[PDB]
Amino acid sequence: MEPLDELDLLLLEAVPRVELLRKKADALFPETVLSRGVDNRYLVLAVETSQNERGAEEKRLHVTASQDREHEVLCILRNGWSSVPVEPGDIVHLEGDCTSEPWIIDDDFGYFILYPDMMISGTSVASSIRCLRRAVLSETFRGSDPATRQMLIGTILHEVFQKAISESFAPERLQELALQTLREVRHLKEMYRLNLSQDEILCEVEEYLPSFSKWAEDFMRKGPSSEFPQMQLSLPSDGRSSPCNIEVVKSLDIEESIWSPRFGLKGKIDVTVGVKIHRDCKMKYKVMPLELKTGKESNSIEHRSQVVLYTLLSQERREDPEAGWLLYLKTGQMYPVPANHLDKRELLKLRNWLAASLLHRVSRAAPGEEARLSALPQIIEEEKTCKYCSQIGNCALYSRAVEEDDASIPEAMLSKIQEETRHLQLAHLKYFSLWCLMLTLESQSKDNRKTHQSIWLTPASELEESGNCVGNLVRTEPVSRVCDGQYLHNFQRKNGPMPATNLMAGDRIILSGEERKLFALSKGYVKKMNKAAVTCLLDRNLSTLPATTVFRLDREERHGDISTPLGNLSKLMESTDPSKRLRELIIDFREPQFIAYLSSVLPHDAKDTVANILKGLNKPQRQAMKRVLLSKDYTLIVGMPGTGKTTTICALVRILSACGFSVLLTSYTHSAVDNILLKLAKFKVGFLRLGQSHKVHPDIQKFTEEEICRSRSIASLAHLEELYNSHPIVATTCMGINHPIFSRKTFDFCIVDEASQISQPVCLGPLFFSRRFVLVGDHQQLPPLVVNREARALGMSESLFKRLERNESAVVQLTVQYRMNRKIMSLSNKLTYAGKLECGSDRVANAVLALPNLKDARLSLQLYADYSDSPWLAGVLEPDNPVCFLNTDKVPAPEQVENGGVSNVTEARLIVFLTSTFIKAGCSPSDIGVIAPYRQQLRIISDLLARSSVGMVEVNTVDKYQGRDKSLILVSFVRSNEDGTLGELLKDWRRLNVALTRAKHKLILLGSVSSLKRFPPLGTLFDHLNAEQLILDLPSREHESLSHIL
Ligand SMILES: Nc1ncnc2c1ncn2[C@@H]1O[C@H](COP(=O)(O)OP(=O)(O)O)[C@@H](O)[C@H]1O
Ligand code: SF4
């Protein structure tokens, strides 16, 4: 903007601007429908402040509930509402009634719900009264309130009381309930975690119990209504003065789980109760929310506010209860909490700021330029609140790693921040700060930002046709229990039939009812799947309204996955000796040490056993074992394809075991960890498997903590502790580091399988409990998946394995492979592994595809085709031609583009033929893998294969094929285009590599050389394929052979 002239012409003034905001809201809230009435969703278009009275702020909002940009509705926020931080492009909901006419919301009328699909927990909202920062930090570093003793006592009491209210408050029965519940594995675990006495906890819990009885005698007495406790309860309901008499009749519901699209609130109502309010000689009956509190009898604002929010939650399910109850089990003293409009308003205003703070996490600085982490809500001046925070750790830490001549942040706190973060170096802070930034961006990616609107706005049918919304279902079969909050249910349709789609038994599913009034309820996972019925395990028992009730099941999306990574990052920053050690080895790249071999590096007694184990192993394997044994810090085992990383890890574990080391065995997937374990079972090496026995492989389930417990009926801290110390080897996944075992045990060694696939901050986790570690991986194979472009660009896809690989001292390669025949090996060897792979034997080397009856299959195919078009088919089927590229050039084989995805029906039809041929040539479908790069193309190939009713071969992307192999791999590359649209995906070297290494005996590759050559990995492949003349050009679709397929 120089000349007079630019200024002139740079004067704008609506249409691209309005549309750019629709894009803006779609970034964070994809597919927000926009609506009128009860569940209104309005898109903000314009925001300004004005002056009424004199010096009185108003906020002038221009909003729309429709996409046609002439449906503009005006809106004025007054008093405290005017200060809510709405910018344009936000999605809002006016719960202050209306939509009929929004106009004015102020002190005395209306609620404004900023980012309504963002359902924040009321407890976090209450927390933020005192400190908004503390709340945000709570929401995001979820583990930095460690489980205290009181929290344990707290849970136990809540639970006893819930059990009591459905039964009796008679002291012997309360004592019984206390006795039973103190023995539940769940609580034993926590006692274990906290190294507490079982009996001491029992004792402490027992002292509360007479209060339980006093309360029940007071309120649940069944006498004259004169004689119930007497208090003022000023409701909406007309007349609100004069005392009245309170009778709790029954508990109606316990742990009522409520999600509010209306207020952007979620909550769990401890106990829902039937209450009779007695008024002179008349009575009113109200279903009301009661919160149990295990601390001091504070009647704090936090505590009351909580209950106020529970009243709002309630409206999602029933009539507005107007008030709620605080119990304080310590004393048996119930307090009324009335939902005043002032409260409901004050809290919902504060709730907005919380939603804003949790959403406005990455800053541009110039709408388009590189990312920053947005600074959190500022540090308070209330130096008393601070004192006892626990979040102070992360607060000081977030401050120092992301802050700003200034500060002017309280100087009694400015020193605490330094005490807390004096142990850390600049590198460390930089590392923390970046890893958050990356994680946040990843978390905020559009894909993992879908709202629950599908569940509560569009009904059952419209959604079942795809994705997952199975829903016209009733239950009648009695609900079984399993343990605590894992109830087994059984559902099927009204009247008769009805379908399936993408709803595979194992899936995370959310179970709502029919009507909007029964949304949320219970969440869980699927057990089995008939097309007559559906069994799933849930956290809630669901009796309350039988028969009449229709239920919808739906899918899900986390992203708040980022809690675990964030945890590990926070733990890394702690000043403990293990965290220092990891800081230096990881952040500071301190060189790992290895000692030189001596006679007694191993316990004398281990040596025969170790020598035997070694003698089983190929040389680089032995070299690997040596490096681990000589390690002082860590070892990196490179598991090149087919080299037997599962056989190797088992061997290491056997050697370490023989040496009298404790080993923590971890991986990314349950499958991978279980595979190693299955091998170890054979060798009769003992181990305990942590994790959920349904996610654990069938034959390992016997070794599970879950199974062992139920099996051997473990009902004492000592017997649980016995099980925990029963095995030197403990096996879990990288995510399962939250187990109470890691509160109390450390290990000589941690081993991480698939270290190269696991995201770096996740991989970090099990290491905190290990003295020396071993990462197993191959960076030539797939990296951790990083969806967000920008994040990927900052280094987010660098596995911990690769990071540490820059110390070659620590790296040992597994190079002798047992998967590929020399021809198939030769490929990946020339392309990727710089000639380092060798065959495990001549057997492996010379193996060609098992095809028992080519003879009559070659004939049956000539019943339409030709023998004079042997060019390809003969070269394709010939087992002695193990590598083969089929060029879809002289037949046109065009790609089709449909909404983000790519397909190719020519290639699809082509491989489906080839598959059918090879099964008919005697290769079983089980031994066959189909690989395509495009999600969309896989669908087409599955369909076409079902059409040919040969369905037993798997079609998939490389991801779902890592460290598995098939005897015959077939690859449709799908890209085939005029000379334009060029993938990002095919450009990837590693993905190609995985594709070329899944095949044992026959590899078949199919795509258009013309367009494929434009991708470097493919370009180079074509070069090596030309040297051996392995490209075979397909004839025209006209030609006799192809004609009948197309
Ligand atoms: N040192 C070795 N000597 C002989 N065969 C081996 C050796 N290491 C691995 N193998 C073979 O290689 C194959 C691959 O190992 P396996 O653990 O079954 O799957 P993967 O290692 O590919 O996960 C096995 O069938 C195994 O017999
Ligand atoms: S420490 Fe004080 S300021 Fe930092 S979060 Fe906790 S409360 Fe808010």
Author numbering: 1 to 13, 20 to 245, 248 to 412, 415 to 1056
Sentences reproduced from the published study:
In addition, the structure reveals an OB (oligonucleotide/oligosaccharide-binding) fold domain N-terminal to the nuclease domain, and a β barrel domain that occurs between the nuclease and helicase domains and which is held in place by a stalk of two long alpha helices. The β barrel and helicase 1A domains pack on top of the nuclease doughnut and extend the cylinder and central tunnel. The helicase 2A domain, which packs with the 1A domain as in the ADP states of other SF1 helicase structures, hangs over the tunnel opening at the top of the cylinder. The OB domain decorates the exterior of the nuclease domain, and is uninvolved in DNA binding. In particular, both proteins have a β–α–α N-terminal extension and an α–α C-terminal extension that are stapled together by the iron-sulfur cluster.
It is involved in the nucleolytic processing of 5’ flaps during Okazaki fragment maturation, of DNA double-strand breaks (DSBs) during homologous-recombination mediated repair, and of stalled replication forks in the intra-S-phase checkpoint. Dna2 contains a PD-(D/E)XK superfamily nuclease motif and a 5’ to 3’ helicase domain.
